[PDB]
Design a binder for this molecule. Structure first.
Ligand SMILES: *[C@@H]1O[C@H](CO)[C@@H](O[C@@H]2O[C@H](CO)[C@@H](O[C@@H]3O[C@H](CO)[C@@H](O)[C@H](O)[C@@H]3O)[C@H](O)[C@H]2NC(C)=O)[C@H](O)[C@H]1NC(C)=O
Ligand SMILES: *[C@@H]1O[C@H](CO)[C@@H](O[C@@H]2O[C@H](CO)[C@@H](O[C@@H]3O[C@H](CO)[C@@H](O)[C@H](O)[C@@H]3O)[C@H](O)[C@H]2NC(C)=O)[C@H](O)[C@H]1NC(C)=O
Ligand SMILES: *[C@@H]1O[C@H](CO)[C@@H](O[C@@H]2O[C@H](CO)[C@@H](O[C@@H]3O[C@H](CO)[C@@H](O)[C@H](O)[C@@H]3O)[C@H](O)[C@H]2NC(C)=O)[C@H](O)[C@H]1NC(C)=O
Ligand SMILES: *[C@@H]1O[C@H](CO)[C@@H](O[C@@H]2O[C@H](CO)[C@@H](O[C@@H]3O[C@H](CO)[C@@H](O)[C@H](O)[C@@H]3O)[C@H](O)[C@H]2NC(C)=O)[C@H](O)[C@H]1NC(C)=O
Ligand SMILES: *[C@@H]1O[C@H](CO)[C@@H](O)[C@H](O)[C@H]1NC(C)=O
Ligand SMILES: *[C@@H]1O[C@H](CO)[C@@H](O)[C@H](O)[C@H]1NC(C)=O
Lengths: 648, 648
């Protein structure tokens, strides 16, 4: 790689908080408002009334000075489990949900509509079981669940509440202020698992519509509405794209299996299926634009026995990139990555400049996510990435040795995960701001720390800055919202403990705007060899930018050239495997599954028996390729009517 | 209350361990053998083959010096989940279960029959899924479950392994070397919940017997065998006292409720039943000497929604004493204690000399146990008691303030939980040795520590001793086994971390034997007023001893006078409430349940319809009172045969 102190010392702002008990929370509120709220919270069970008092501080000068405003919430306290209830980014809505320290017949909330500058008190006609839920369509609409399983809505932002149903088990918002929720009759929700009923409301609670029966669970994802249904006993999954008017059971090749949705968009659906026997690993399947017909996409996917957590991450810094973790035939764990939205996975390339090279399964990079947390491994954070920071991925990774599993390191990718480099030794808390101009990490240890590690050139070069002469036990790291933000907030405590917050500003470090000479063009990776598809991602070609090495300048432009997307010709990577086909390890072409050979491929689609005839290729939902490779397929109707639905 | 340093500094033995990875475990092996093992373990998923090496140190001088014996276990490693497998106290058996560092087709064990002084290496014909399991009747027999759900046994202390059944979900030893397990057929055990089968072997695996069908789960306790059965769907609990030859369904007063067993011994059985509605509280029922006929004992019993953990605790330091935590009418958590084996519960007396006196529910002592851990409160250890140390109880407690909940304190009872006293500020790890003569505790914090707190007068006076000028981060505290043990072991590390263990010996502190002038007589508490039953516990009267205040002497005698138990006359406290009756709050007499008044009390006992007629009193199983109060009851047979069994 290859003065910076005075730039940060003049912009390091400290503030000490005295006599704080319990857990300490800190949240910037909105973009470029200077509002930071610090909140004391306490771990108290939900059905218990306890005596306690939450301290509440508000800054309006970007972490310089804080004003105690606890008088606003006198005689109340905030559960850690709840915390704050911030709304959308530019909505200025902030709710604080609390309980009356003496106890009351109802909860008490503090609603702000001006980025926490002025609050009004409103007492609740119930005890809230779960936090407030904003409608994504309308910040003024709110709902939450009572401790008596009652569903409460407000049309005027928590001022006037109305109870709309009394037997509710779960409730989640939908598009256009539609609310879905399960209900029952006999006893408890835990008792009537498999006999619930799924309802829908288009009128905030005026009218209802029962969309389903014999329900075990439900959930949302992208343009899909999911519901697990029990026929008696066995359990099967159904999907609807029309907010529950019409359903169809999901169709898989190859009983008594357990299902799990991994993600979903406006395009497709990732579903994981445990291998019979509950062996510890399963199979991922991918759906079409309707989310009905599923095909094998990745074998031997690890999941935690208790919980089902998986290393599956949606890499936000590159479209159509997902990384997960799988079990090799030698029973060594491997990180897999797809660049074509689950069309074809590839082993994660070992990191350059780290020649481990003994055993072959050894020295492979494993990236740590939700499975690795679940196995109680020393991983402070999941893989982090921001949409604005194209190509930048930061995560925790390990070599094939049990010593490196106990002490993971921080790796950085600049190309959506194609190439990796160990950048920090040992675990760290990281965050991304400035649209990727600034990368800040902070060591995670049992000893007090006082070292900020940051990076201005997309993680390629790092530098350390001691922000205080008094090391503090680390507690939290918050970044200011905004694409061009340069303000962070670190808080912790000393040793009766004394909390303290430092607001560091990178204004004087990044004062010069970057010119075109500080950027360097680079294309995304394409699994298909040759230049003819170099940079093609689901049929679109886009050129990218990147900060040079040791670049210390403020970016004002987006990393996409925004010239024009040129359409690429269709190739293998632009197609998923069809129903009954899969791609074997390291392989590029799809082949029929062994157990289905010589048998007629049949499935059931919206109460119809359908016969499939393919070359084994299905266009990727969302792929925009044209011309080139064009594998055919046909879906003809049959005679039988079949039964593809277990609800009405 | 009202020199001690030289007595401990000369007896503090430090040993430094260099270059250790992973978790560190430390254990004494046997009574007065001076064998201490130290083991390195690693957090690796069970299904993964990883490369690793577990370090292993033996001391045979009670902690003074340790010999690295890792070469005994070269090229293997031990999982943290497995740790050691120590047999019975005086058996001398030690197993070390490990996996081959490269991966293998079996595990590999290291067996020792001589208090860990010599080990033999044996390879397993299977990957162990669960740790080894000794038979309580014969320490030579072991058994274990393989990763392929294979049940394996050994009649010759893990030397020769034999697979006796291949579809085993769970298996558990029994009296006289009998083995219980569950089997299935279709798919996984997770898929055959409610369709399992319960089997039994008296011949270590030669002969089998299917004792129950349609099984959900099962367990052992005291002289009872339990088994949750599914009817279709609904779930009911069955009990058998004859190792599974004849069963009966449990009989409760007052559908689709969730059952749980709390404890059970050679006399009676404690059951918890979630209130319909999964409201976060339930109701405790006790049985008779046959484990069938249940009767309300404590209402509004708190349980954790996810997992069902409760605060129930068996004060093994006093016969007939148990403590748990209930939800008052004021939604405040309260500790409730019984001194008559669940016959009549009483609020836990607030501590003296701590005149908190604001609110009535406030200043109530809440004792933290399993429910409080489930709720993730800052509680390092549960209540601790030793049957050798009569009356001694130590645990973690709180006032009704949310601040005090966050930082619990440690309280002490010398009278079996009748009276309590705040003795230490803040959470601590604590432990008991010398049969109550020495009580040691260690601060629980983020900062490294170097201070031991100990007490030589059964918790009444305390004293600190700084055992090292090099503070260390705390990890573990172990005592030497024995009735008169005086050696402890403290281990932790500095900051690449460096582990270190200190063996402190209280020989020079307790050199003078206690005479009779150092003891003071005291009787146990009896709920019934008056002296005529003062000291009566389930019909037996026994006088107790106690060390005076500020007593620093070595006890050589047991705290029970062992004169002779005099039988007490029967009173209320010596009777449980009958079927359909209960004792209300603060109340002494049993009354019929409201919903059963005017209705004929009927239940079903071993396929018989039985009609009950009582005054509402049932002799306590194990109560030895004679004469005095004698409430009658009658159980007459009827005409109907009824159906009290779902397993054939
Ligand atoms: C990131 O941090 C910088 C601080 O280095 C923030 O800049 C601060 O912006 C406020 C806006 O209120 C400045 O206060 C005043 O704004 C009024 C607007 O009428 C203006 O007339 C005054 O002259 C003054 O600028 C504040 O001075 C400025 N900070 C410093 C240290 O000067 C910035 O807003 C933060 N967040 C981002 C970039 O979103
Ligand atoms: C998986 O991650 C990718 C990026 O990692 C996510 O892709 C992003 O999806 C969102 C919503 O589909 C897109 O937002 C867009 O907002 C504009 C605002 O005007 C709107 O007009 C568009 O209709 C769309 O909603 C976003 O552009 C897109 N990212 C990129 C790079 O294009 C994806 O949603 C994540 N989850 C999946 C695939 O389920
Ligand atoms: C832990 O406590 C024990 C007592 O509970 C201390 O006892 C030590 O025991 C050993 C024997 O294992 C004594 O050594 C000798 O035993 C032989 C017989 O084999 C005998 O002929 C000798 O006369 C002698 O007794 C040793 O003396 C004894 N230690 C002391 C200080 O007397 C043990 O020392 C305690 N742990 C620590 C770390 O001090
Ligand atoms: C609460 O703790 C007490 C501690 O005593 C539990 O144990 C019961 O204790 C007595 C005395 O130790 C046991 O005596 C038995 O002695 C015979 C021979 O004299 C022996 O064969 C037995 O194996 C046993 O040691 C009694 O059986 C024991 N209960 C059990 C589980 O065996 C009491 O069980 C605990 N609370 C409950 C109600 O579970
Ligand atoms: C696939 O390629 C990887 C290296 O990229 C190699 O370790 C593995 O053995 C190959 N597997 C097969 C089945 O070809
Ligand atoms: C029971 O006694 C406790 C104090 O031991 C008291 O606080 C409570 O109000 C009493 N309740 C009833 C119903 O008598």
């Amino acid at each position: 790689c290859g003065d910076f102190i005075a730039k940060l010392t003049n912009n390091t702002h400290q503030h000490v908080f005295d006599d704080l008990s319990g857990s300490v929370s800190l949240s910037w509120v909105g973009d470029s408002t200077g509002v930071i709220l610090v909140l004391t919270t306490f771990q108290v069970p939900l059905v218990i009334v306890s005596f306690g008092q939450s301290k509440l501080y508000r800054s309006e000068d970007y972490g310089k000075n804080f004003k105690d405003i606890t008088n606003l919430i006198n005689n109340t306290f905030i559960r850690t489990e709840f915390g704050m209830a911030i709304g959308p980014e530019n909505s200025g809505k902030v709710i604080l949900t609390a309980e009356v320290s003496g106890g009351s017949r109802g909860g008490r909330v503090f609603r702000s509509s001006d980025f926490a500058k002025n609050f009004v008190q409103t007492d609740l006609p119930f005890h809230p079981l779960t936090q407030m839920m904003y409608s994504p369509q309308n910040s003024d609409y709110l709902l939450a669940l009572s401790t008596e399983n009652g569903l409460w809505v407000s049309k005027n932002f928590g001022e006037k509440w109305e109870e709309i149903h009394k037997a509710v088990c779960l409730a989640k918002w939908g598009p256009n202020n539609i609310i879905f929720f399960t209900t029952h009759v006999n006893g408890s929700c835990k008792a009537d698992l498999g006999a619930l009923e799924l309802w829908r409301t288009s009128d905030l609670g005026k009218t209802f519509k029962t969309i389903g029966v014999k329900i075990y669970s439900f959930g949302l994802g992208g343009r899909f509405l999911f519901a697990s249904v029990m026929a008696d006993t066995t359990r099967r999954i159904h999907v609807s794209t029309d907010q529950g008017d019409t359903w169809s059971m999901a169709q898989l090749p190859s009983q008594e299996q357990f299902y799990s949705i991994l993600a979903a968009n406006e395009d497709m659906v990732f579903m994981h299926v445990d291998e019979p026997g509950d062996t510890g690993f399963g199979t991922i399947f991918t759906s079409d634009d309707r989310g009905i017909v599923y095909s094998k996409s990745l074998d031997r996917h690890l999941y935690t026995t208790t919980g089902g957590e998986t290393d599956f991450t949606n890499v936000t810094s590159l479209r159509g990139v997902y990384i997960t973790s799988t079990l090799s035939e030698d029973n060594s764990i491997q990180s897999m990555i797809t660049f074509d939205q689950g069309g074809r996975w590839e082993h994660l390339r070992k990191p350059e400049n780290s020649k481990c090279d003994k055993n072959k399964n050894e020295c492979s990079l494993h990236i740590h996510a939700s499975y690795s947390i679940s196995q109680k491994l020393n991983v402070p954070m999941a893989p982090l990435s921001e949409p604005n920071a194209v190509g930048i991925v930061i995560a925790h990774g390990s070599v094939g040795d049990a010593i490196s599993v106990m002490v993971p390191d921080v790796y950085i990718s600049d190309d959506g995960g194609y190439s990796w480099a160990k950048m920090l030794e040992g675990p760290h808390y990281y965050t991304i701001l400035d649209s990727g101009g600034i990368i800040v990490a902070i060591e995670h240890s049992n000893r007090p720390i006082n070292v900020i590690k940051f990076s201005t050139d997309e993680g390629q070069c790092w530098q350390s800055y001691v922000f205080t002469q008094e090391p503090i036990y680390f507690t939290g790291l918050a970044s200011e919202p905004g694409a061009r933000s340069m303000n962070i907030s670190i808080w912790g405590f000393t040793e009766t403990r004394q909390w303290v917050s430092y607001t560091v500003d990178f204004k004087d470090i990044l004062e010069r705007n970057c010119e075109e000479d500080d950027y360097t063009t680079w294309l995304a990776h394409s699994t298909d060899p040759g230049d003819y598809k170099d940079g093609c991602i689901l049929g679109y070609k886009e050129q990218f930018l990147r900060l040079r090495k040791s670049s210390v300048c403020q970016n004002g432009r987006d990393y996409v050239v925004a010239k024009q997307p040129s359409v690429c010709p269709c190739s293998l990577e632009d197609f998923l495997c069809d129903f009954g086909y899969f791609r074997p390890e390291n392989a590029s072409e799809c082949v029929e599954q062994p157990e289905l050979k010589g048998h007629e491929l049949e499935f059931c689609l919206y109460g119809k028996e359908e016969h499939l005839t393919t070359n084994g290729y299905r266009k990727i939902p969302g792929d925009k390729c044209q011309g080139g490779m064009n594998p055919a397929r046909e879906v003809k109707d049959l005679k039988k009517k079949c039964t593809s639905n277990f609800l009405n």
